[PDB]
Design a protein around this ligand. Structure first.
Ligand SMILES: CC(=O)O[C@H]1C(=O)[C@@]2(C)[C@H]([C@H](OC(=O)c3ccccc3)[C@]3(O)C[C@H](OC(=O)[C@H](O)[C@@H](NC(=O)c4ccccc4)c4ccccc4)C(C)=C1C3(C)C)[C@]1(OC(C)=O)CO[C@@H]1C[C@@H]2O
Ligand SMILES: Nc1nc2c(ncn2[C@@H]2O[C@H](COP(=O)(O)OP(=O)(O)OP(=O)(O)O)[C@@H](O)[C@H]2O)c(=O)[nH]1
Ligand SMILES: Nc1nc2c(ncn2[C@@H]2O[C@H](COP(=O)(O)OP(=O)(O)O)[C@@H](O)[C@H]2O)c(=O)[nH]1
Ligand SMILES: [Mg+2]
Lengths: 412, 320, 426
């Protein structure tokens, strides 16, 4: 029934504090109410401390807040092997102590930031140690993969080609939200050149609320977590769909809010609104899980979608007749009291697997090579319990992820 | 003299590996290619289980020995995981004529050139033995010299000054020196049979000659490098002094790979400064003889994993 | 986390006074007083530079190494001079001769053990150690020689913790000493092989940047020092603050050093406007990158425009949009694709603290790893040879128990170091 969550890496923790905020906010549980149902991991104390100093301070147990005073290191190796190792046990312990206390759970919603040290590496083995300790569950990892041109870390790819290959054979469904492609939404669909990280977080903090929160919440067309991976992954590769939200209108500027279904659903497939720089440049969808929430008439959907199924310029895979999982919830969304999110009475958090990422992975793989081609910051990992193996052998890994996402599509 | 070459050697399955029933997974091709499920391979030469110690030596070391006796430099690297065949290939049955490896043969050929030239020539054979352990150069011939420095020669090329030089006048003297040094080598024991070495080993054979009548002098350097295998520290679970050992071994192998890759592509810049090992060997890689990297592999399900890694270390051969 | 500063030599020392003059105020620590901190955040992370004893006395955890009493006795007899626990003062009343050899082999080698002693008392302080900060000048005895030894020992004692080095490489135009290239070439040698992050500052790159980027007409040393200390605060201490995207010595190290040499950087501060007038506030952000990335404004002597970059780390510290930050960096990376090296898709390492420099609204430290610094070690290396060739003031070295092969060594080493760095400019 439940779904634990492990927010790993400063980012996964910032986003965590955010997604965790939106929660109580739409459940009437102020600062000090019940008890969360997740944990927080980081090898840099000062960040988890922000959850220990700032807002939502006492809504957590100093037990579900793991820290390694030591060093973060923007390098996979160190975070996965060398350092990150020391903490893992302890980490697990909570996701085994928190996993017990419950009643027939469904899985762990993992929150990490692909291209980091504590986020890429660590998790790599966290999800790793999970796939074995609970192979019998769902492992949906919600990632924030590398901005297409606006990356931060100098190494980023090293850290992301490595978190992909190690987690690939362990996740159930990996959701992806592109940090940059979300900015566009903040520039083009909300207008603000002042987007603090605290915003992107409010956003995913939204799209995510549509996943677990409301879905695990009764409705006219419930959709379990398992449901996802089933209706969402055509193949064992921990396939990565993309998150998209519909009413991303500004709560100040424009106001046409009352944008009946027929509109908000069409607003999902236009590439300028998908929290991912993977513009459907060719990527044929192969399965979409249209999660609606608020006042929505099933016919409105079983029509708004029909209209789409016949737009053709939206070309769905061949081997897939119908790939539209319509998830209907009741309670409308719940916007921050005064952030910058419109606040409509219905939304569409549609996520999907698109042959599109054939790109995004490509462009991120290429990156890697360029540097590896010169070993660049390699000495930083080797000296951290890794080898020419793990790199070269994780490169070959993704290689067959560029072929995979190519074969499962583009061909009939 | 002077292209770099890597040579692969597969050992037979021992008494130990047969009951399991591991089927022939390696389907050799030609005399240079080995196919295991992977990427396509190719090396300068691939020696099967049937290939003699004599046949192995002639192809990998014989030309380097001739160059050293002619006054030039040369280097021989031996790489492989535990139970790959390093000991058997490099030393074997040290006193037996058939069973002897690479080192007793080099030493045989050197002393066969010596004596045969006693007419106007005066020979001096100087040996040195050091290990690189925890990024420190430890003399294996003097236990007091645990942290040792380079200085530069007449041309501004570095060399290991203070390295205990031992004068050797026979093939038996060289073997005794190797044995003495081995007893000082940083070894680790998982099981009594296993010999993990947490350190890279460098054995130096310096062949000095003075032509009494011509007054002309030669000094050829032969470097025998024993490489500890790359360690996946996630596996093994190294820690404290082990994890620091594993990182250090891995770093050194990366450095070495970066150096050989640079020299293979005939690049202007060769990153000898990446490790203390590549700097000790700088003069003997640089502008010298036919460096040979001998990589030892195990056949069977025993090691498709570690065998694969052993071949990926060697990825610089002939590129491209 | 933590670090332990090291004031090697006079310069490195003089600067200590300025680095601590600043940092303290950037942490509300009065002379011997405690935390008067205008805020409450300038305390949760102080540890990085102090120690708890009394309850109002957080003492800087640095080391003051020098063979010339008068110096430390000027730093200890002035302003903040009375905050260092006397135990910190590792003096060498000997003759602090201006010889690299006199402070590395003969005179300094003695005072070393009595230093390492303390560098251990401070390291074994508490919590977890990160690395050590090292200030000095590569143009003297107590600086290049003895300080370059202090590290060679440090890096044998904790090859785990990092080593940032702040070197005052011998300015071009005019040398404030004569053997300079001797004391220098010899110390850079030691650097390229122990510390793993070096920030090279040039007394004349500063003047310039201090007399034209600050209409400042009488730039006393105190100033230069002050400007420098401003950068080293943005680096360390800063990142030991919160941030949307924070980093720390390692990130900085693990994102800036592609190849083990250690490589040296060139720090640059952001708002560098003259007092009154200039107070243009054009600091929205494009103004900071405008700044940081220009030629002038690079504390180094060389000009970036003269050689690609390998890595860059804009360590900003003041509330801004992870969008207008992450964005700007890009155009910058495209307007100058020419010089920014290619085999690194994203050279830049954007870092973002929150709280800014006490009195300012928005700043951003720049730590560049450009191949341009090739044209400096060249300089140094040249000066050497031109004088080595004639063994100029060599008797002051050898006569101190040195080697004719020692000088050879260093030059070559550091000389090769020039070579390599070009391997990427191409
Ligand atoms: C009224 C007002 O706003 O005054 C400003 C000011 O006028 C200006 C000109 C300051 C001023 O700085 C200088 O004039 C200066 C003098 C010698 C060397 C270098 C700089 C200032 O003195 C410096 C001072 O800086 C700080 O307070 C920072 O926290 C800074 N602190 C110190 O350097 C410091 C100085 C004395 C004692 C202890 C610390 C800092 C910067 C980076 C990291 C840590 C701390 C500031 C904003 C100002 C004055 C006071 C006039 C500027 O410098 C800095 C470092 O902020 C020079 O260009 C900038 C722009 C500022 O607007
Ligand atoms: N959406 C969103 N992205 C974030 C947030 N914080 C960081 N990121 C992104 O995630 C990545 C940053 O990871 P870091 O903060 O460097 O590292 P970490 O994953 O927390 O772990 P360490 O490297 O060990 O500190 C970058 O790509 C950022 O753009 C956030 O609050 N929201
Ligand atoms: N920025 C700066 N440079 C200094 C200071 N003091 C000396 N220098 C520089 O240091 C060099 C001289 O070395 P010095 O510090 O006297 O050596 P030592 O005292 O014998 O170790 C010259 O290039 C000076 O410009 C200072 O307080 N600030
Ligand atoms: Mg973090």
């Amino acid at each position: 029934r439940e779904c634990i969550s492990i927010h790993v890496g400063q980012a996964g923790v910032q986003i965590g504090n955010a997604c965790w905020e939106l929660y109580c906010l739409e459940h009437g549980i102020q600062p000090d109410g019940h008890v969360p149902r997740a944990v927080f991991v980081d090898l840099e104390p000062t960040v988890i401390d922000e959850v220990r100093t700032g807002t939502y301070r006492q809504l957590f147990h100093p037990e579900q807040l793991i820290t390694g005073k030591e060093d973060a290191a923007n390098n996979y190796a160190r975070g996965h092997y060398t350092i990150g190792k020391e903490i893992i046990d302890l980490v697990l312990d909570r996701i085994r102590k928190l996993a017990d206390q419950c009643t027939g759970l469904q899985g762990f919603s993992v929150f990490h930031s692909f291209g980091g040290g504590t986020g890429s590496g660590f998790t790599s083995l966290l999800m790793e140690r999970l796939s074995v300790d609970y192979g019998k569950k769902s492992k949906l990892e919600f990632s924030i993969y590398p901005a297409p041109q606006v990356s931060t870390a100098v190494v980023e790819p090293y850290n992301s080609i490595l978190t992909t290959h190690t987690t690939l054979e362990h996740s159930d469904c990996a959701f992806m939200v592109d940090n940059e492609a979300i900015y566009d939404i903040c520039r083009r669909n909300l207008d603000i050149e002042r987007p603090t990280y605290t915003n992107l977080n409010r956003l995913i903090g939204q799209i995510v609320s549509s996943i677990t929160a409301s879905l695990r919440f009764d409705g006219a067309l419930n959709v379990d977590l398992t449901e996802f991976q089933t209706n969402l992954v055509p193949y064992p590769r921990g396939h990565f769909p993309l998150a998209t939200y519909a009413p991303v209108i500004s709560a100040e500027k424009a106001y046409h809010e009352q944008l009946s279904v027929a509109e908000i659903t069409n607003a999902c497939f236009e590439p300028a609104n998908q929290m991912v720089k993977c513009d459907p440049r060719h990527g044929k969808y192969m399965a979409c899980c249209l999660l609606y929430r608020g006042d929505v008439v099933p016919k409105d959907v079983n029509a708004a979608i029909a209209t789409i199924k016949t737009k053709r310029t939206i070309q769905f895979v061949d081997w897939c007749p119908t790939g539209f999982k319509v998830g209907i919830n009741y309670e409308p969304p719940t916007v921050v009291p005064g952030g910058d999110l419109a606040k409509v009475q219905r939304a569409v958090c549609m996520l999907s697997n698109t042959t599109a990422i054939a790109e995004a992975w490509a462009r991120l793989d290429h990156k890697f090579d360029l540097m590896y081609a010169k070993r660049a910051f390699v000495h930083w990992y080797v000296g951290e319990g890794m080898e020419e193996g793990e790199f070269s052998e994780a490169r070959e890994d993704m290689a067959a992820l560029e072929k995979d996402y190519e074969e499962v599509g583009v061909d009939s | 003299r002077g292209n770099i070459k890597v040579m692969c050697r597969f050992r037979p399955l021992n008494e130990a590996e047969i009951l399991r029933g591991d089927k022939f997974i390696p389907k050799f091709k030609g005399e240079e290619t080995v196919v295991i499920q992977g990427k396509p391979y190719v090396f300068d030469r691939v020696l099967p289980p049937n290939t003699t110690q004599e046949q192995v030596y002639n192809a990998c070391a014989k030309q380097i020995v001739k160059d050293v006796l002619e006054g030039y430099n040369g280097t021989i690297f031996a790489y492989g995981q535990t139970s790959s065949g390093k000991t058997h290939t490099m030393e074997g049955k040290l006193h037996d004529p058939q069973l002897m490896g690479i080192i007793p043969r080099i030493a045989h050929d050197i002393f066969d050139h010596i004596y045969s030239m006693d007419e106007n020539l005066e020979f001096a054979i100087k040996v040195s033995y050091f290990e690189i352990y925890l990024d420190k150069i430890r003399d294996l011939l003097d236990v007091s010299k645990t942290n040792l420095a380079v200085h530069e020669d007449k041309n501004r090329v570095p060399y290991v000054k203070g390295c205990t030089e031992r004068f050797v006048s026979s093939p038996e003297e060289v073997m005794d020196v190797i044995d003495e040094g081995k007893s000082n080598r940083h070894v680790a024991v998982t099981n009594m049979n296993e010999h993990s070495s947490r350190s890279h080993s460098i054995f130096l054979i310096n062949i000095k000659q003075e032509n009494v009548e011509t007054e002309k002098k030669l000094s050829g350097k032969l470097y025998l490098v024993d490489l500890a295998g790359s360690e996946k520290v996630s596996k093994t679970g190294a820690e404290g002094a082990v994890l620091d050992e594993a990182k250090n071994i891995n770093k050194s192998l990366s450095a070495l790979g970066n150096v050989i890759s640079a020299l293979a592509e005939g690049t202007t810049h060769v990153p000898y400064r990446d490790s203390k090992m590549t700097r000790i060997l700088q003069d003997s890689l640089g502008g010298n003889c036919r460096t040979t990297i001998v990589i030892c592999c195990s056949p069977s399900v025993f090691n498709e994993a570690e065998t694969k890694s052993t071949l990926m270390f060697a990825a610089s051969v002939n590129s491209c | 986390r933590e670090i332990v500063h090291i004031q090697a030599g006079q310069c490195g020392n003089q600067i200590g006074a300025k680095f601590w003059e600043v940092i303290s105020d950037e942490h509300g620590i009065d002379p011997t007083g405690s935390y008067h901190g205008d805020s409450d955040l300038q305390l949760e992370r102080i540890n990085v530079y102090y120690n708890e004893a009394a309850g109002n006395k957080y003492v800087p955890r640095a080391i003051l190494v020098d063979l010339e009493p008068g110096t430390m006795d000027s730093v200890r007899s002035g302003p903040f001079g009375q905050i260092f626990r006397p135990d910190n003062f590792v003096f060498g009343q000997s003759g602090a001769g201006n010889n690299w050899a006199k402070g590395h082999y003969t005179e300094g080698a003695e005072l070393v053990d009595s230093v390492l002693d303390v560098v251990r008392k401070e390291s074994e302080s508490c919590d977890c150690l990160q690395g050590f900060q090292l200030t000095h000048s590569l143009g003297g005895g107590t600086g290049s020689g003895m300080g370059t030894l202090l590290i060679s020992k440090i890096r044998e004692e904790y090859p785990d913790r990092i080593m940032n080095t702040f070197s005052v490489v011998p300015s071009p135009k005019v040398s404030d000493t004569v053997v300079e290239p001797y004391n220098a070439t010899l110390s850079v040698h030691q650097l390229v092989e122990n510390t793993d992050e070096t920030y090279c500052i040039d007394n004349e790159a500063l003047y310039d940047i201090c007399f034209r980027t600050l209409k400042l007409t009488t730039p006393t040393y105190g100033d230069l020092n002050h400007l420098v200390s401003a950068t080293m605060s943005g680096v360390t201490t800063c990142l030991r603050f919160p941030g949307q995207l924070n980093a720390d010595l390692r990130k900085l190290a693990v994102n800036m050093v592609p190849f083990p040499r250690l490589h040296f950087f060139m720090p640059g501060f952001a708002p560098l406007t003259s007092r009154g007038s200039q107070q243009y506030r054009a600091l929205t952000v494009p103004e900071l990158t405008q700044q940081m990335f220009d030629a002038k404004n690079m504390m180094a002597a060389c000009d970036p425009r003269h050689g690609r970059y390998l890595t860059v780390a804009a360590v900003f510290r003041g509330r801004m949009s992870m969008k207008e930050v992450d964005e700007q960096m890009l155009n910058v990376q495209n307007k100058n694709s020419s010089y920014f090296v290619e085999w690194i898709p994203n050279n830049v390492k954007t870092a973002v603290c929150d709280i800014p420099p006490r009195g300012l609204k928005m700043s951003a430290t720049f730590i560049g790893n450009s191949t341009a610094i090739q044209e400096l070690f060249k300089r140094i290396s040249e000066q050497f040879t031109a004088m080595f060739r004639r063994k100029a003031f060599l008797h002051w070295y050898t006569g101190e128990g040195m080697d004719e092969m020692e000088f050879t060594e260093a030059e070559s080493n550091m000389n090769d170091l020039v070579s390599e760095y070009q391997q990427y400019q191409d």
